[PDB]
Design an enzyme around this catalytic site. Structure first.
Site: not given
Lengths: 470, 53, 501, 469
Positions: A158, A184-185
């Site tokens: 993604k 998000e990471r």
């Protein structure tokens, strides 16, 4: 005014209630700062509950707080900094540069909350963005100033898909871009930071044609919620005040939905269907409505969406599904077929795809593709049990073309010169229409299926056929 | 003689298949109906639990 | 004897307290006390109830501050005074935790004497920033060939082991720990992963068997075992991953590489559920409180490959989530799936099928990819992914049992052999240097010919043969870690030679 | 302690007392309300402040008059333990309900007892063979273990346990505890009679078994602490006598269930499906009070009434976590008529290993599992199209598996009445051999009916001859 002193009354969760001084009212959607041993904890006023006791949502950790302790009132929504100075730094939710490129030299600040442009202001021209990614271009072309939507699974490249878009479209684009990451990471973050330094879209000593607002999941759910609003306000400044075009990107917007659902629960609202916030529709609406192409500017948002367990019937993707102009679905199956892009060809619909808009030729070619693939899928079940031998002669040729077309969709990404190490390709829009036309006409029915796999244009289909022939 | 026996058998066999498949439609239909009802109940209970608080 | 010295120490604890905060217990029950008072009270503070019960405090209310007991309430009673410790929860962190089982509060429960602690740390510590992180580039080899090949493990990565209840669920993880014996025994500190196995919600007997297994393979000499057995309090269980994380951070901080297995987080969620619902917090989605995502995410984001300015530190994480009935749409499984950087789906049907370790390769991803895969192993396993993918498609068609064409049966025959190649004996990981040949053989189709039944025999024999002759070659695979033209040729020849045995 | 109180509330069997003096019993203390129904024993579970506790009532609460005088017995209920327990059926309170009058008490011990420590643990490795073929083949038991059963209760579940008692407990000898939480009173009477008949209870002599019985008629609250009471009796044997015991629990679903009933009344926000939030802790505590310490090894057998036979239900799910071996028995396999009805693809033991029972056993089991899993895999195809439309190779597998399925039934002597077939126990050594042969198709040449409802391989051979006539 004269800083309204508040004493915390309840540290519950993100919800921290403050008991501001009597005879001096705070206001809905204000910003409270609480001086803390680490920075200023920001609490956004979200309800008034009376006796000058507000219930506010935290935007930073609430650990170690002592019930009662002076709370200054800075008033009005959290006001970020905006400027052309904001380009070239990573800026956290509370508007502080977290890449430590020193304090941003503010021109203006603006509130996180802002009103969506009026119907009168909103006037949107249909223009056609070029993606270069063959599947996107033919089967669901993107549109300038659009509200492109990358509906898809979890991190199924993604990030990669968005990265390809940034690599091609952003670098090409004259406008600014804003990369906003919601929850998000930090592995993904660090990669993006490094990569966009590498692609030079950020040149630390040089200029930066992008700004970053990295909101990560290691932030309280409340803080996660207002990452979106912050990023948007930077875009508004670009759109309006700088008057330039933009190319907004937000990632992943399911995290935006999810975050809001959590603090809804904390706000004490009776949970709505599948536990989503009962305010989901209007909140999504505020974000989407704020993003628009006004007379002032044009903003081309690309918003990632994670479809939980790939069920688009789930209310969170479904609510978003309406609100985005140019849907694209990236499906598990296609990824599994080894076809990267993972775009689902028969499940990609774009507002601009109308015959007049994309030109009659483009339309006709794409219409033929759609029928061919849909036929292939309908016949797939028949091939499964009966076999291919029981199908019509016409059908057998159609199946053969469909398999060829299926792998003709494949294109190696420029940003997967790491992932696959295969040189990327940018194929001109006209060239794609032409090349697909040839295939459909069957002027390459003497070409084997694997000579369509991860090619580019027509030239490439032929070249990889010659290579394979040897 | 053989070709006729083959096609005749194929007809007989595929007919018996249709019968077996029909029974399975009914069996999974009951499962579907039960499952549908259960989903409504389970979701509803969650809503009640929230409301009760 | 020992008693006289202990009594001397006990006599040696005196000196009045000034108890600057008091509060009277009132509503107490369900192990969740609520005390009235405590005007000064930090959030997440540890408060010593006067009965020798200590309880952290998680809800501050303008009436009654809700202090969750870490003990049983059969020692607590109404109207007790509580004295605020004045320290937010903290654990001893040090090198001495190596070879020790410790409970949540850091008491050795294996009673190998007091922990040699180089510090104390705090349960919540903010995750490594974007700025202090450098990209992963350091392999971690689990010694399970399928794992290494399909979903390679690196350092600072979070990869979720997900699948049906205790399908040797612990054992899948335990294998990774066991293969880290090869480097760990080795003196290469740049390949030293100190391993922390965290066991939440498991019974004392299960834990005891595990530590015994670790002692049997003599791997406990690098293991830290953090345990929170099912007897132990729900607050202590909730606190248990976060105090494990800090223990890991001491290694991480030292720059030393480490790996933390969080088995099973699913029981953390149950614990947090209990805790929240008896803190009277509004019931969350699927009854798990709605901030569980935040809870799990903050825990998980503390494993990272820190930057080279931060001395290339790296705590690596492996979360483990039990899927109840394999329901991947359940709220707790969904939440974790998002947070993590991989899925290592274990499938029960394939377990029963005798594919042990059991991995549904379609539901298994490594989103952090082959940047952490051994360079040699990347070359050999290059089309292994394609072959397996083809095998899956082919297998589906094959169910219908239509007369398959030769191309489909080339795949089918190759695929069947590959599946048998993947299989490995539980509690017996294999050296990567000797997994590279096996994959070369398979991928270069030599095994495709070899009959399915005797693949297992062939594998054993092949290793023996390579040990006999191409042990020069094996040394090179270890040493150079990339198969050069010469190595590829040597290996090709060796395999060819061993085709007829 | 003599602490007067009045009954403020009687909301179900969760009476609330309001002590009038400022001396207040602690949580898990016990109180006796004396009534013309004798004492009613209640146990403090919350302190709700203002000198008002709220107490679970372990006896029926009908007829109570609000404001009724209470007196506090103080501390957890103390049962009476010894070897004098052996040869008694005891009520939750500890009353001798087998009416052998007052139990000669040695030490009377509190019902609540903290679970032994991590250090105290001692791991088992024993093989305990039941002579039940399916058990032996698929998942061998071990002495000290925690054995588990799942499915409909007393639909064959009770019978299975009875077969286990019949086999294991005579061979084992020594102390053994039977504790039956919420069981059908008539079934309990049958057990009592049967035990006396098989001399395990010899009331004229001594009994090497003790019994605790909690009827399902007993109030929900009473049923909650039947289990804790039994565990105390077991602990006396485990610890103080230090001789290996046995323990039977049927059903431990009733333990969970009872808790869920009281939970609502107690005032807890209901957790999913409606289960008590303290479900995890209560089950955890209970299951760690059943263990094999270095002090003693207690083989336990736990019976889980799975509601609606849905394993996904949270109470059965959390039970699955604490068991050491399970042999889930499935209604489907019951419909197939295979008694024992143990599902063969849903059994596990940590004792099934190629070290523990050796490679040869493990190999035999591996093939059984693979064969049966294939057979399960082809169930769809079998239904949609005939078996003749399966591959020839597969047809051999299918035929073998059909035979294995039939072979797995082992007539049980306790079920001799029901089956009408004299039961047979087959040696562990014999079992491995019998399956090995079948797997090599040695005796595959004789009807499926030959394998149906009969014992060992030799018996099958003979039964072929019987059919052949």
């Amino acid at each position: 005014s004269t800083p309204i002193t508040g004493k915390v009354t309840a540290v519950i969760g993100a919800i921290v209630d403050v008991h501001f001084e009597q005879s001096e009212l705070p206001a809905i959607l204000n910003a409270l700062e609480i001086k803390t041993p680490q920075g200023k904890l920001v609490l956004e006023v979200a309800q008034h509950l009376g006796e000058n006791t507000v219930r506010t949502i935290a935007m930073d950790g609430t650990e170690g707080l002592v019930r009662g302790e002076k709370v200054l009132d800075t008033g009005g929504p959290i006001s970020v900094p905006v400027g052309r100075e904001t380009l070239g730094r990573i800026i956290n939710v509370i508007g502080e540069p977290i890449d430590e490129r020193g304090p941003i030299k503010s021109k203006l600040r603006k509130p996180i909350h802002a009103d969506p442009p009026s119907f009168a202001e909103q006037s949107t021209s249909a223009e056609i963005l070029e993606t270069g990614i063959k599947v996107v271009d033919l089967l669901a072309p993107y549109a300038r100033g659009g509200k492109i939507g990358l509906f898809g699974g979890a991190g199924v490249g993604k990030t990669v898909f968005i990265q390809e878009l940034i690599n091609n479209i952003a670098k090409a684009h004259g406008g600014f871009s804003v990369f906003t990451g919601v929850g998000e990471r930090t592995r993904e973050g660090n990669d993006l930071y490094r990569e966009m330094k590498e692609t030079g879209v950020i040149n630390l000593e040089g200029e930066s044609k992008v700004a970053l607002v990295f909101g990560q999941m290691n932030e309280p759910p409340g803080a996660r919620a207002r990452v979106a609003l912050t990023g948007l306000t930077i875009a508004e400044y670009f759109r309006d005040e700088e008057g330039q075009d933009v190319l907004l990107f937000i990632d992943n917007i399911f995290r935006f939905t999810q975050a809001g659902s959590e603090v809804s629960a904390l706000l004490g609202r009776i949970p709505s269907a599948v536990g989503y916030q009962p305010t989901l529709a209007t909140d999504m609406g505020l974000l989407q409505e704020r993003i628009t192409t006004t007379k002032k500017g044009s903003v081309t948002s690309v918003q990632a969406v994670y479809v939980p367990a790939d069920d688009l019937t789930d209310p969170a993707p479904a609510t978003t599904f309406a609100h985005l102009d140019a849907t694209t679905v990236l499906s598990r199956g296609i990824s599994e077929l080894g076809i990267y892009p993972a775009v689902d060809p028969l499940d990609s619909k774009s507002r601009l795809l109308d015959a007049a808009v994309v030109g009659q030729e483009h339309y006709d070619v794409a219409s033929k593709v759609q029928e061919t693939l849909q036929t292939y899928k309908s016949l797939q079940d028949i091939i499964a049990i009966l076999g291919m031998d029981e199908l019509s002669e016409q059908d057998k040729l159609t199946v053969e073309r469909a398999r060829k077309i299926q792998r003709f969709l494949s294109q190696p990404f420029a940003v997967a010169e790491v992932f696959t190490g295969i040189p990327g390709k940018l194929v001109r829009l006209k060239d794609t229409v032409a090349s697909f036309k040839a295939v459909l006409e069957g002027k390459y029915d003497n070409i084997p299926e694997h000579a369509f796999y991860m090619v580019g244009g027509i030239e490439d289909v032929v070249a990889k056929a010659e290579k394979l022939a040897a | 003689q053989g070709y006729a026996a083959e096609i005749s058998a194929r007809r007989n066999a595929m007919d018996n298949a249709s019968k077996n498949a029909g029974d399975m439609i009914n069996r999974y239909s009951i499962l579907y109906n039960r499952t549908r009802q259960a989903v409504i109940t389970n979701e509803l209970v969650d809503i009640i639990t929230g409301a009760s608080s | 004897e020992v008693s006289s010295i202990l009594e001397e120490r006990i006599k040696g604890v005196s000196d009045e307290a000034n108890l600057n905060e008091t509060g009277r217990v009132l509503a107490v029950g369900d192990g969740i006390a609520r005390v009235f008072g405590l005007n000064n009270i930090q959030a997440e503070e540890l408060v010593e109830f006067s009965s020798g019960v200590k309880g952290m405090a998680l809800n501050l209310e303008p009436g009654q501050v809700g202090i969750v007991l870490f003990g049983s309430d059969r020692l607590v009673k109404e109207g007790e005074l509580v004295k605020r410790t004045g320290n937010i929860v903290d654990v001893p962190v040090g090198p001495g935790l190596l070879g020790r089982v410790v409970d949540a509060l850091g008491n050795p429960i294996d009673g190998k004497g007091p922990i040699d602690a180089a510090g104390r740390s705090r349960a919540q510590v903010k995750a490594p920033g974007i700025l202090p992180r450098r990209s992963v580039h350091e392999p971690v080899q689990t010694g399970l060939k399928a794992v290494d090949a399909l979903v390679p493990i690196g350092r600072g990565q979070r990869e979720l082991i997900i699948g049906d209840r205790q399908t040797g669920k612990t054992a899948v993880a335990l294998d990774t720990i066991l293969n880290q014996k090869r480097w760990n025994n080795g003196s290469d500190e740049s390949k030293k992963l100190y391993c922390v196995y965290v066991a939440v919600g498991q019974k004392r007997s299960t834990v005891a068997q595990l530590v015994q297994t670790l002692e049997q393979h003599d791997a406990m000499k690098y293991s830290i075992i953090v345990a929170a057995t099912a007897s132990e309090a729900a607050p202590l269980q909730y606190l248990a991953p976060f105090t494990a994380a800090s223990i890991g951070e001491w290694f991480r901080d030292n720059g030393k590489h480490a790996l933390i297995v969080y088995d099973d987080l699913s029981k953390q969620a149950v614990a947090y559920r209990q805790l929240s619902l008896l803190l009277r917090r509004p019931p969350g989605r699927e009854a798990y409180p709605g901030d569980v995502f935040y809870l799990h995410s903050r825990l998980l984001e503390r494993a990272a490959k820190l930057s080279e300015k931060e001395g290339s530190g790296s705590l690596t994480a492996l979360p483990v989530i039990e899927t109840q009935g394999g329901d991947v749409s359940a709220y707790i499984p969904t939440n974790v799936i998002s947070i993590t950087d991989g899925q290592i789906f274990l499938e029960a049907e394939l377990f029963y099928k005798g594919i042990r370790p059991a991995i549904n390769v379609g539901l298994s991803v490594s989103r952090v990819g082959s940047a952490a895969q051994v360079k040699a192993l990347k070359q050999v396993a290059g089309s292994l992914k394609l072959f397996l993918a083809q095998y899956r498609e082919v297998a589906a068609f094959a169910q219908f049992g239509s007369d398959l064409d030769a191309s489909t049966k080339q795949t089918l025959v190759r695929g069947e052999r590959l599946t048998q190649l993947l299989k490995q004996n539980q509690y017996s990981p294999l050296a990567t240097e000797e997994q590279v040949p096996l994959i070369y053989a398979g991928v270069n189709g030599h095994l495709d010919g070899i009959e399915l039944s005797r693949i297992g025999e062939f594998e054993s024999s092949f290793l023996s043969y390579l040990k006999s002759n191409h042990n020069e070659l094996l040394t090179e695979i270890r040493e150079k870690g990339e198969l050069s033209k010469e190595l590829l040729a040597s290996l090709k020849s060796a395999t060819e030679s061993f085709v007829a045995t």
